[PDB]
Structures are given as C-alpha cells and as structure tokens.
Amino acid sequence: TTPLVHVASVEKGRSYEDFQKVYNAIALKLREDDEYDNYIGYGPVLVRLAWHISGTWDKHDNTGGSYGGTYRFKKEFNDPSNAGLQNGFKFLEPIHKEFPWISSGDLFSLGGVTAVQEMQGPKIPWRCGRVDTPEDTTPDNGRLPDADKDAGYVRTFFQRLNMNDREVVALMGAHALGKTHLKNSGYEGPGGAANNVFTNEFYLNLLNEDWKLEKNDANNEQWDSKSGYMMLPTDYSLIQDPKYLSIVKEYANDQDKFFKDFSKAFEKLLENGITFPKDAPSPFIFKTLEEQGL
Amino acid sequence: TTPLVHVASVEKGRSYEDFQKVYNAIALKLREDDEYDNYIGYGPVLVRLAWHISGTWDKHDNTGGSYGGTYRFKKEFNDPSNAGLQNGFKFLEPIHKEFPWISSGDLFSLGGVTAVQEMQGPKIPWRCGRVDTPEDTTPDNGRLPDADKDAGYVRTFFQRLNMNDREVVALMGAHALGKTHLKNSGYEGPGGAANNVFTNEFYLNLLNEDWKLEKNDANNEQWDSKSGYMMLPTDYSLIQDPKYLSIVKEYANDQDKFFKDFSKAFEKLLENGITFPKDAPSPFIFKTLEEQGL
Amino acid sequence: TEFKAGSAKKGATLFKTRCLQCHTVEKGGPHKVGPNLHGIFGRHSGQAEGYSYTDANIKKNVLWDENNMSEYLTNPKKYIPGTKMAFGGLKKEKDRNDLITYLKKACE
Amino acid sequence: TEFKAGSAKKGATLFKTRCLQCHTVEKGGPHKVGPNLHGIFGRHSGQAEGYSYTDANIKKNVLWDENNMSEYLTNPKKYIPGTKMAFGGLKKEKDRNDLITYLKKACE
Ligand code: HEC
Ligand code: HEC
Ligand code: HEC
Ligand code: HEC
Ligand SMILES: Cc1ccccc1N
Ligand SMILES: Cc1ccccc1N
C-alpha cells in the first residue's frame, strides 16, 4: 500500500497576509507575556514546541511529523520527554480560537518560526498546507531523543529525520535559547547569558567556557561551567566528536553562516514528511514586528 | 513682500510605508498607555493638540498653522489656553526620537489623524511635507477660541480658519472625545458616556439630553445634564443658532454623513496655510492596527 | 479554561472607569445607554427586561460565560457587528480576567 | 521630564532577571559579559575600562541620563548600531521607568 503520502492543501481561501496576521498575533502576545519564566519569554518554548512536534517524523514509513498537528491528544502530551510544552500549547490556544480556520500543524510550526524571527534570529521561510489527521492517528512515544547520550546517539537518531552532521550542529544552536527546568526534564540551568536572543553563543560557550561534569538535584549528570551555564550530555557530545567539533568552531567564528544554515535546516525540519504540490504557493517570508514599525 | 508662503517639502526618500511606521508606533502607544486620565487614553488630547497647533492659523497674513511646527518653542507653549497639552508632547517625544527624520508639524498632525482612526473614527487622508521654522516665526498667544462665547463668536472665529457653517459643526463633533478638566480650562466633565470612541454622540446628546446652566467650582458657567454630562457654552450655542441647529440634527441621526464631513474638514484644518506642489504625492490613507492584524 | 482568577479589586477599578458611566451591576439597578448587567451570566443575549436592544444583539443568542465574555470585551464589533455599544475594548488579557472576576461577584 | 519615576522594588526584580547575568551594579563589581554599571549615569558611553567595548559603543560617545538610556533599552541595536549587547529590549514604558529608577539608586 506504500508509505503514507501527506499532500499540502492550502487552507481554502487563505493567502499570504492571512498568515502574516497570524504571525503578528503571535509576535504580539510574545511581547505582552514577557513575564513568563522569569522574563525569558514564551519564545524558547515555542521554538521547542515546533521542534518536538516535527521530531515525531520517521523517514522510513513517513509517520509523524508536523503535518498532523496531533498535539491536542492525550497519549503524546504526557510524555516524560515532553513536560513543559503545555505552556506553549496554552499560549497558542487563544490565537487558534481567533483563527479557527488554521490547522494545528501550520500553527505550531508558524509559532516556532515567529519565535525565532522575533528573537532577532534569521528569517525562516514558511509554507502552508498542513492538514489535520484523524484522532485514530498519533505517533508512539519515545520518538524524540534522550539528553543523556553521546554523539553517536545524536548522529544515529537524526538520520531518522534525514539530517546530516552540518544540519544537526546547526539545529543544536537553538539550545542557546531558554533553559532546562528540573521540574520538567531533570536538568537545570541555561546555556548562556543571552537566552531569549538568537545568537551563536551556544557554540562559543561550548568552546571558550570551562566545563565540569557534575550531578544536579535530580541525580542527573550534566556539564556545568563556573559562570553558571550548563550543557546536556548530547550537547557536550558536539565537542567530543571531531566531525561535530569542526562545525562548532565554524559557527563560533561565523554567525551569518550559522544563521544561513539554521534557516535551511529549521525549515527542512518543519517541512519534513510533507510533500508539496507544484502549483502550491512559493514559501512565505513574514516581516518582523520591528519591520512593521513596532 | 506679500504674505508668507509655505511650500510642502517631502522628507528625503520617505514614502507611504515610512509614515505608516510612525502611525503604527503612535497607534500602539495609544493601546499600551490606556490608564491615562482615568482610562480614557491619550486619544482625545492628541486630537486636541493637532487642532490647537493648526488652529493657530490666520488666513489673512498666513501666519501660524500646522506648517512651521513652531510649537516646540517656549512662548506659544506656556499660553494659558494650552493647559493640559503637556501630556500631548510627552506622549509624542519618544516617537520623535524613534523617527527623527519627520518634522514636528507632520508628527503633531499625524498624531491627530492616528488618534481619530484608532478610536474607530473616519479615515483621514494625510499629506506630508511640513517643515520646521525658527522661533523667529512663532504665533503670539491668544488667537485660539474662547469657550465662554456664543454662536456669533464661533462663526466669526472660524472665518479666520476658512471654515463655513457645515464645516465648523463637523469639527465640533470631536468634543464627544475626552473631557474638560477644571485645572486646565476652568470647566469640568465629559460630554457623554463614550469619550474615547469616535461617535456622533456629541450631536445626539446635545439634542436629546436635558441641559441646565450652572456654576462650576471655578465659578465659570457651563451647561450640565443630570447624567453627569457637560457642554461648553460655545458647544451649547450650536443649538442656540438656527442654521447651526440645522446641521446638528443632520449629523444626529446620520453618522456616516458626519464621518465624511469631519474627515474632509479635519484634513483642511491640518493642511491650512500650506501650498502643495503638483510634484507632491497624493495623500496617504493609513490602515489601522486591526486592518494590519496588529 | 481560558479566563482565570485575577484581582476582583482591580477589576472593580476597571469597571468604575471603563463601564460605570454606562453599566449598572446591582440587582434591578437603573438603566442607561445600554442594559443592566445583573444576571449577565447564565444568560442569553437581549434578555434584560425594559431595555430596548437593537435587534443586532439578540439576533445571536449564545449564553454568556467567563470565556466568550473575554473576547467580546476584546472587540465588541468583531463579536457582534452592529451592536450599539461604543467601547475601545480590553486588549490586555490581564485587564480582561480581573474585570471578569468582579462581574461574577457584583452581578450575582 | 520625559520619563517619570517607577518602582525601585519592581526595577530590582527587572535587573535580576534581564540584566544581572551580564552586569554587576555594585562598586568594584567584577566585569562580566558586559561592563560594570556603577555610576553609569553622568558618564560617556564606552568609558569604564577593564572591559573591551566594541568601537560602535564608543563611536557616538553619549552622556547617560534617564531619557537617552530609556530608548537604548527599548532597542539597543537601533540606538547604537553594531553594539555587542544582545538584548531584546524593554518595549514596555513602565518597565523602563521601574528599572532606571532602581539603576539610578544602585549606581550611586
Ligand atoms: C457606553 C458607552 C458603554 C460602555 C463604556 C460599555 N458598554 Fe456594554 N453595552 C452598552 C450598550 C449600548 C449595549 C447594548 C448593545 C445593543 O446592541 O443593544 C451594551 C451591551 C453589553 C453587554 C451584552 C448585554 C446582553 O447581551 O444582554 C455586555 C456583556 C456588556 N455590555 C458589558 C460591558 C463591559 C464589561 C464594559 C466595560 C468593560 C462595557 N460593556 C462597556 C454600552 C456600553
Ligand atoms: C548580555 C546578554 C547582556 C544583557 C542581557 C544586557 N547587557 Fe548591557 N551590555 C552588554 C554588552 C556586551 C555591552 C557592551 C556593548 C558594546 O557595544 O560593547 C553592554 C553595555 C551596556 C551599557 C553601556 C555601557 C557604557 O556605555 O559604558 C548599558 C547602560 C547597559 N549595557 C545596560 C543594560 C541593562 C539596563 C540591561 C537590562 C535591562 C542590559 N544592559 C542587558 C551585555 C548585556
Ligand atoms: C530546533 C530546536 C531544537 C532542537 C533540534 C532540539 N531542541 Fe532541545 N530545546 C529547544 C528549546 C528552544 C529548549 C528550551 C525550551 C524552554 O526553555 O522552555 C529546549 C530544551 C531542551 C530540554 C529541557 C526542556 C526543559 O524544559 O527542561 C531537553 C531535555 C532537550 N531540549 C533535549 C533535546 C535533545 C536530546 C535534542 C536532540 C538530540 C534536542 N533537545 C533538540 C529546542 C530544540
Ligand atoms: C477637531 C478637534 C477640536 C476642535 C475643532 C475644537 N476642540 Fe476643543 N478639545 C478637543 C478635544 C478632543 C478635547 C478633550 C481633550 C482632553 O480630554 O484632554 C478638547 C478640549 C477642550 C477644552 C478643555 C480642555 C481641558 O483640559 O479642560 C476647551 C476649553 C476647548 N476644547 C475649547 C474649544 C473651543 C472654544 C473650540 C472652538 C470654538 C474648540 N475647543 C474646538 C478637540 C477640539
Ligand atoms: C543546554 C541548554 C541550554 C539552554 C537551553 C536549552 C538547552 N538544552
Ligand atoms: C463637552 C466636552 C466633552 C469632552 C471634551 C470636550 C468637551 N467640550
């Protein structure tokens, strides 16, 4: 019967600035709810949200992926590796009530794109046409990676997402954003001083800072610097592996390259498993609230 | 060598979208600072400020008007009839430093335009090109109307502004907005229930409510209603005049006619004393924050 | 949920300054430009005895609860296009919540 | 004045969360990612040494007061293009007042 084929179908009657208005609604609520997570902002968790819903994709049978937008269910909401994402879902709930016509998938992904751009990151071209699957369909748990691993685990895991070394290290640059919460994952602390502003700091801190493998209050082992920062095992793997290392330094000295490659990879990630028709609209590039004079 | 001639010179390389940015910045700050004057917003005072700076015009010698932006200067600033307009400039100062290219006159009048539209009033076409002039040419104090006068005074006064019967009644619809402050003018109270939303309520209240001549705590006399509303004597004289009353009841049961007459009249007011070249672009129609989905 | 418990003390303040010149909270209170808000929860539209609603308000009857009240106050004309209620709108979610907590108390 | 006075207890709760990671305010404070801010008011930009400023910060050499600081913290890149400070900005006016008021105290 062949693996499933998820075809993009534009929300009927909707065009470029139908979505640009949704972009703005998110960018606005971002600036308003600035108090969240001790003034970190909803930005990071929205980026995380777009990743964890895109990370359910499996290239082998085309199951999962952002096309579904199945995040409204029970079985993938209570995942141990997913705790804390509900703050992102509740953030989006009012704007989905505002635009009932938009699909769950297109919202979660747009929300992640809106977060990265408004946090002074690169422009991420976005596309539409994600459609909502039956309640019957929902990706099994354990589709998302584990933070207590090595570089081999990361490389191997990301193969399932059709990602190569360069794409992986790029996407990882996002762990400059926000922090780890002990009540959520069993890890605690940020990876840098600027965690609500998209920067290449992740690679910089990974090289210049002095890391010591410690034990936090959840009995989990993480890498801590005496400047206060922290790194997941999987993140520290990037400087243990030699092939990963050279890319880390590349992004540490070259931020525009990192931006350019993150944009590609992130768009790819959000657009995995969805096959776009050829009459389908060219990818959207929304302008920031700063570009609209706000 | 014959009366002053003020030529509209467009700010270098600035087009529609530049001035739309200035509108947006102002329109956002109207929504952010919603606590001002017991939650009426900065809307009314900005409308007033634009009127007051362009109301300084004199058609005979072509002195004053909204052109020179001469209001930044001291003499006409500490004028008695100007109490309360301080808040109008404290409001616009941060916008001016964000867009330092725009002239004082363009900003002053744009604030008036922006306020009206954001308070859900008519679309007011706005032209650019005003340029600043030195304190050398600053209108002397006391060429703006007195509140304690009658219809004859009103009609006569507005002949100086080149406004006829139909026009002055429209412009006077703006006294639905905001309120009167005793510490400012010596009169106290609003003219209706909804004074931060642009409506024809002025004409309806003027006609329908029951008014009594009373003393206020400043010992000035004003027309009061038992609903807590008030009217300036000049406002009341709009029903004491036969031909003024003709227009009042006209706008009373028809809001659209008022809206279109107000727009044209307001635009003339802000543009009075200004000569526009053919080289000059057609006036802008700025879209609101709702229309931009902002 | 969408709304959640905020300050009923600041919601009163928001009612004093943005509603009280219109709306009356108390049971069987006087009328005004619009209706009397007593029993506005567990309530259709245009029920208020004695007030003349424009038919635009009662032409959509959906029971007022703590949620649909929130985005009616965000923009009264995006909810009921043709309502004669002239109001700027509560664009701040906090201001909405705090005012919703007060109106569920005074309009008991 | 342009900007009013705010809550220094609110400003201190704005510094711990949005500034303290890059900045120290107390006298003889250790130089972090950003320069020590003690006595920043009444001082030219890119002045306090021990820190390596980008030359864009020293480029326009401004005297720090209440009103010029406020817009620099609204959009650090718009006011000083090429600045090393990675900050989203204080888009809220009250948040600017509260913080500057606290900063005005701690810089003494
Ligand atoms: C006068 C200027 C008002 C202000 C300020 C507010 N409201 Fe109002 N309201 C007003 C009118 C004239 C009407 C009736 C509109 C119609 O078409 O008949 C209303 C109506 C409401 C309703 C709905 C009543 C119902 O459905 O039976 C609600 C829930 C309401 N108003 C609440 C409300 C609140 C909470 C306000 C301030 C925050 C507010 N209104 C402003 C007049 C005016
Ligand atoms: C790191 C992520 C920072 C955060 C968060 C904040 N600041 Fe900062 N600051 C930082 C750097 C790298 C620099 C130098 C800029 C350059 O171009 O080199 C600064 C500088 C300042 C200054 C000016 C110092 C001077 O003129 O001598 C000020 C007044 C300042 N920073 C204040 C400030 C405030 C109030 C912040 C939080 C609200 C804040 N900064 C955040 C690094 C970082
Ligand atoms: C492109 C984006 C992206 C990718 C890819 C990504 N993450 Fe993250 N992750 C985030 C963001 C953003 C946060 C912080 C969210 C927050 O602060 O709420 C985060 C935080 C976390 C947390 C802690 C969450 C919490 O609240 O404590 C864990 C655990 C984690 N990531 C594991 C991983 C692992 C393991 C991988 C891959 C091997 C991975 N992530 C890949 C974006 C990403
Ligand atoms: C097009 C707009 C406009 C015109 C024309 C206009 N006004 Fe007003 N005026 C306003 C607005 C809006 C307010 C309310 C300001 C506020 O609430 O801060 C106001 C307020 C006032 C006040 C009281 C200010 C205070 O703080 O107490 C006086 C007095 C006044 N106007 C006099 C006049 C007189 C006299 C005329 C003409 C004969 C006139 N105005 C024409 C817009 C206008
Ligand atoms: C290590 C890390 C730091 C900051 C935000 C996220 C992560 N994963
Ligand atoms: C009657 C009135 C109301 C509001 C503002 C001004 C006036 N004049």
Side-chain angles (χ1 to χ4, degrees):
Chain A
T1 173
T2 328
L4 310 88
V5 185
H6 290 327
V7 47
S9 182
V10 178
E11 281 90 358
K12 295 170 301 182
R14 302 302 170 181
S15 61
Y16 167 74
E17 79 160 350
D18 278 87
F19 293 112
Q20 169 68 78
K21 286 183 180 189
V22 185
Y23 176 101
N24 293 331
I26 308 182
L28 275 182
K29 187 174 173 64
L30 232 48
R31 276 180 37 164
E32 306 294 333
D33 295 25
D34 68 331
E35 277 189 352
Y36 175 78
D37 214 338
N38 296 294
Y39 293 87
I40 287 183
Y42 274 95
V45 72
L46 279 191
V47 172
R48 188 190 190 234
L49 185 43
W51 144 240
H52 270 2
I53 64 125
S54 284
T56 56
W57 186 59
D58 197 318
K59 73 181 184 185
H60 305 97
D61 54 357
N62 192 28
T63 58
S66 80
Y67 186 80
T70 55
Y71 186 49
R72 66 266 209 69
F73 294 138
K74 176 214 306 173
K75 51 241 99 164
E76 66 277 45
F77 188 82
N78 299 327
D79 302 15
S81 50
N82 261 28
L85 278 183
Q86 86 277 28
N87 303 141
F89 176 78
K90 292 169 181 178
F91 179 98
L92 259 47
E93 206 167 26
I95 77 193
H96 191 274
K97 289 169 54 199
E98 172 169 0
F99 310 93
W101 50 265
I102 207 176
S103 64
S104 305
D106 279 332
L107 184 61
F108 301 142
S109 59
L110 184 53
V113 173
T114 304
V116 182
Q117 290 194 178
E118 288 302 305
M119 286 190 281
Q120 295 166 254
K123 268 74 180 173
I124 282 83
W126 184 79
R127 303 183 71 151
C128 52
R130 294 174 188 81
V131 192
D132 304 334
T133 59
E135 171 141 346
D136 171 47
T137 74
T138 288
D140 298 75
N141 317 339
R143 275 176 175 252
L144 286 134
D146 203 81
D148 196 23
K149 303 286 170 187
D150 50 272
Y153 179 89
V154 170
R155 174 162 298 113
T156 296
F157 163 76
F158 269 111
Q159 284 173 351
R160 208 194 66 219
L161 296 179
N162 197 35
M163 300 288 174
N164 61 30
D165 294 16
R166 166 164 297 262
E167 289 169 321
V168 171
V169 191
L171 295 171
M172 290 312 192
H175 272 181
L177 299 176
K179 69 191 283 290
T180 54
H181 309 80
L182 203 73
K183 295 188 173 64
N184 292 341
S185 55
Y187 297 88
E188 173 63 35
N195 56 343
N196 54 3
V197 177
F198 207 87
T199 57
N200 64 326
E201 184 189 13
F202 174 75
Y203 312 96
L204 287 174
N205 285 342
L206 216 41
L207 298 178
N208 301 13
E209 294 289 315
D210 289 328
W211 300 105
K212 183 207 146 195
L213 183 62
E214 308 184 26
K215 198 158 67 64
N216 60 24
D217 294 8
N219 316 123
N220 278 323
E221 293 182 350
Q222 54 180 70
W223 296 83
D224 299 346
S225 69
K226 308 312 164 188
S227 53
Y229 309 146
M230 68 86 63
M231 284 297 172
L232 302 168
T234 49
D235 298 352
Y236 195 77
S237 300
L238 300 191
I239 63 180
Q240 289 180 310
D241 184 282
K243 286 146 301 176
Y244 280 150
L245 237 194
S246 55
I247 312 180
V248 174
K249 316 141 178 169
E250 183 174 343
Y251 292 156
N253 293 276
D254 194 322
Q255 186 180 97
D256 37 291
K257 181 75 179 183
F258 161 59
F259 272 44
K260 208 80 172 186
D261 289 349
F262 183 88
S263 191
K264 284 185 181 72
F266 200 53
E267 176 174 18
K268 181 180 173 163
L269 169 62
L270 300 163
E271 293 170 10
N272 269 140
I274 158 78
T275 165
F276 291 89
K278 266 188 166 188
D279 43 29
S282 188
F284 297 130
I285 294 178
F286 310 99
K287 41 178 170 176
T288 60
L289 247 50
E290 189 163 346
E291 287 164 328
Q292 308 183 27
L294 301 187
Chain B
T1 160
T2 226
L4 301 86
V5 167
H6 300 133
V7 179
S9 174
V10 183
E11 293 90 341
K12 79 177 191 184
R14 308 296 176 170
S15 63
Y16 182 97
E17 267 290 350
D18 288 90
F19 295 101
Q20 179 75 53
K21 284 186 168 192
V22 187
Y23 175 105
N24 280 11
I26 295 180
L28 186 60
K29 196 180 205 288
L30 294 176
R31 251 168 51 189
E32 295 296 333
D33 313 338
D34 54 321
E35 91 295 343
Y36 174 74
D37 200 350
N38 300 341
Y39 292 88
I40 77 172
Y42 274 97
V45 64
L46 280 178
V47 167
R48 177 172 182 232
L49 188 148
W51 139 248
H52 189 291
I53 61 121
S54 75
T56 196
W57 183 56
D58 182 15
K59 74 190 190 186
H60 309 130
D61 48 24
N62 194 66
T63 57
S66 85
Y67 184 83
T70 75
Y71 213 95
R72 58 202 195 277
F73 305 128
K74 184 180 181 176
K75 174 138 192 58
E76 68 186 296
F77 174 80
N78 302 111
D79 177 47
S81 56
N82 272 113
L85 291 191
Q86 176 69 20
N87 316 43
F89 300 107
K90 294 174 157 184
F91 184 93
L92 296 171
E93 283 176 355
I95 283 87
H96 214 164
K97 205 173 100 179
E98 182 172 348
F99 308 83
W101 43 265
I102 197 175
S103 54
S104 304
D106 278 343
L107 183 53
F108 290 156
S109 58
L110 189 55
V113 171
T114 307
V116 173
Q117 295 192 165
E118 289 302 298
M119 292 189 289
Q120 302 147 234
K123 284 283 187 62
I124 297 172
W126 180 85
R127 290 202 178 94
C128 57
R130 296 169 187 79
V131 82
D132 301 337
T133 71
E135 185 241 312
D136 161 49
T137 156
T138 274
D140 288 345
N141 303 17
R143 55 166 79 185
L144 269 122
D146 201 311
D148 194 27
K149 299 297 179 182
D150 65 332
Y153 180 93
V154 177
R155 175 169 293 103
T156 302
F157 166 79
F158 276 105
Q159 287 171 359
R160 213 195 65 202
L161 288 188
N162 199 41
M163 317 290 308
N164 82 308
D165 279 337
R166 165 156 301 269
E167 291 171 318
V168 316
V169 179
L171 292 181
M172 221 54 62
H175 275 172
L177 301 167
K179 59 185 295 298
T180 317
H181 311 84
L182 202 73
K183 67 182 179 311
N184 287 334
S185 62
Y187 297 87
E188 178 69 24
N195 52 8
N196 63 339
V197 185
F198 211 94
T199 59
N200 64 341
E201 196 198 2
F202 183 77
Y203 311 96
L204 284 176
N205 296 346
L206 210 48
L207 199 134
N208 291 337
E209 299 275 318
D210 265 339
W211 305 105
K212 338 150 293 182
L213 195 63
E214 282 186 348
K215 297 188 211 171
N216 57 27
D217 297 339
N219 262 316
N220 291 314
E221 293 193 345
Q222 56 181 62
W223 296 83
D224 286 354
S225 79
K226 333 243 64 159
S227 291
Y229 307 149
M230 70 84 62
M231 288 292 176
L232 299 171
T234 48
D235 295 347
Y236 193 87
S237 77
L238 247 43
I239 305 216
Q240 294 181 316
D241 188 75
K243 298 166 308 302
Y244 275 159
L245 179 54
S246 305
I247 314 301
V248 170
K249 181 173 175 178
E250 177 176 326
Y251 294 155
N253 14 83
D254 192 280
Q255 185 170 109
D256 269 326
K257 197 66 171 60
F258 158 63
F259 262 45
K260 278 316 295 163
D261 277 343
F262 178 89
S263 180
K264 196 179 263 284
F266 198 67
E267 182 179 5
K268 176 160 65 164
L269 177 70
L270 299 183
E271 289 174 8
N272 268 337
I274 295 181
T275 297
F276 291 93
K278 170 55 184 59
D279 202 312
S282 278
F284 308 130
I285 302 294
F286 301 114
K287 268 167 172 152
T288 73
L289 290 191
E290 279 181 0
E291 295 161 12
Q292 295 175 92
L294 285 170
Chain C
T1 48
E2 191 273 346
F3 145 88
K4 249 310 147 64
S7 172
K9 107 192 297 192
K10 190 200 171 186
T13 297
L14 297 176
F15 193 91
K16 301 156 200 169
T17 58
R18 313 210 60 162
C19 303
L20 197 47
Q21 64 275 14
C22 287
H23 290 286
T24 300
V25 272
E26 327 294 346
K27 178 182 177 62
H31 279 90
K32 41 108 177 183
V33 47
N36 166 258
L37 284 185
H38 180 70
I40 203 64
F41 294 99
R43 161 102 160 66
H44 336 138
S45 70
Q47 277 162 283
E49 204 81 34
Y51 185 73
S52 73
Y53 284 73
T54 59
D55 39 14
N57 197 319
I58 210 172
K59 268 174 185 178
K60 248 305 114 186
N61 289 326
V62 160
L63 307 189
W64 294 109
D65 69 335
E66 322 169 0
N67 306 290
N68 56 14
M69 177 75 68
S70 184
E71 40 256 1
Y72 170 70
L73 302 188
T74 305
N75 195 7
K77 65 122 185 178
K78 273 292 178 58
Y79 198 78
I80 312 177
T83 176
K84 63 175 302 176
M85 161 160 142
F87 177 57
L90 310 173
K91 310 300 186 177
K92 308 187 173 184
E93 194 172 30
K94 300 173 45 197
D95 286 318
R96 297 196 292 256
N97 288 21
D98 302 344
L99 184 135
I100 293 173
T101 61
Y102 169 78
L103 214 63
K104 241 180 307 162
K105 184 176 179 180
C107 295
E108 260 286 340
Chain D
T1 187
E2 154 52 38
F3 281 103
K4 332 164 68 179
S7 167
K9 69 179 281 187
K10 178 71 182 307
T13 51
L14 278 181
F15 201 97
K16 177 190 43 164
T17 52
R18 310 206 68 177
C19 304
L20 187 55
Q21 56 258 49
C22 291
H23 293 299
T24 45
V25 269
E26 71 279 1
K27 201 181 191 64
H31 267 325
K32 332 186 64 173
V33 189
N36 171 264
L37 293 174
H38 196 75
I40 188 62
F41 290 98
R43 179 171 77 183
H44 286 100
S45 59
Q47 189 93 352
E49 254 318 300
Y51 180 85
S52 179
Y53 298 93
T54 61
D55 288 34
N57 185 273
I58 321 176
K59 236 264 298 180
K60 232 105 71 174
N61 184 252
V62 294
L63 228 43
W64 289 118
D65 56 54
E66 276 170 339
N67 37 277
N68 67 343
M69 169 82 70
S70 190
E71 305 245 352
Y72 171 68
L73 306 183
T74 311
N75 199 312
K77 298 231 170 182
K78 273 297 173 184
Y79 186 79
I80 306 179
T83 185
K84 187 188 170 178
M85 172 152 126
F87 187 61
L90 311 167
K91 312 303 178 180
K92 297 183 175 186
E93 179 170 2
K94 321 191 76 63
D95 287 340
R96 301 194 293 265
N97 289 339
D98 304 338
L99 176 87
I100 293 182
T101 301
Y102 161 77
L103 200 57
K104 238 305 180 184
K105 174 192 185 302
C107 291
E108 294 170 346

